[PDB]
Amino acid sequence: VGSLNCIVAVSQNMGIGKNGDLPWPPLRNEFRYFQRMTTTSSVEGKQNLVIMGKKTWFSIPEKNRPLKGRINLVLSRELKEPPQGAHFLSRSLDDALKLTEQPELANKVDMVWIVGGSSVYKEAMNHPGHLKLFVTRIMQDFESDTFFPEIDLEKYKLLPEYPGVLSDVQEEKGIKYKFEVYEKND
């Protein structure tokens, strides 16, 4: 199994969601970036795995659900089986990562992408080992009711560029944003 990663888009006030949707209006190219980064795998005969909490799963409109071309895993202790359209269900983050090593998935999964929400991000980020964060900084404040956990910059280094990630300011619907990649190894 290849690398472990988180990917998020976050306002200046650290918001990632409001009422089960994003705090900002739809940013089509931002979403295209999320789909590209999470779907593209350099290893022949493998797909990437996306890991998400239950409320994030149900935030994806049925049209984009499961995320196509990726294996979709949902975290929940209440659910008894994967939701309609999902592929896997685990009861903890550690369980989901252990599962990638089982015979059913060990030779099928390339990268692992944690796609939210706030508790899953927090636990992924505080878990020893090699981890990258792909963070889109939406450069305005937006009313939110979720939030991204604190990024400890003593351990997460902001990389000075990264292949396949544009380094300059983007703008859609009058909202400027930029792409960042952070890496820790502890």
Report, in Å, the least distance between residue 8 CB and ligand D2D: 5
Is residue 28 part of an annotated ligand binding site? no
Residue 170 is labelled as binding a ligand: no
Q: Is 154 a catalytic residue?
A: no
SS (H, E, C) 169-184: CEEECCEEEEEEEEEE
**What are the counts of helices (DSSP H) followed by strands (DSSP E) for the chain?**
4, 9
Contact positions with ligand D2D (CB under 6 A) in 88-127: 115-116
What sections of 117-158 are H helices per DSSP? 118-125
Q: Which of 4, 23, 24, 34 binds ligand D2D (CB under 6 A)?
A: 34
Task: For residue 79, state whether it binds ligand D2D (rule: CB under 6 A).
Answer: no
Q: Which two tokens stand for residue 5?
A: 């990663």
What span, in angstroms and rounded, lies between the C-alpha atoms of 108 and 40? 14
Containing H/E element for 110? strand 109-114
Which entry of ligand D2D, ligand NDP, none binds 180, CB below 5 to 8 A by partner kind? none
Q: Is 30 a catalytic residue?
A: yes
Contact positions toward ligand NDP, by CB under 6 A?
8-9, 16-17, 20-22, 52-56, 59, 75-79, 91-93, 115-120, 123, 146
Residues recognised as catalytic: 22, 30
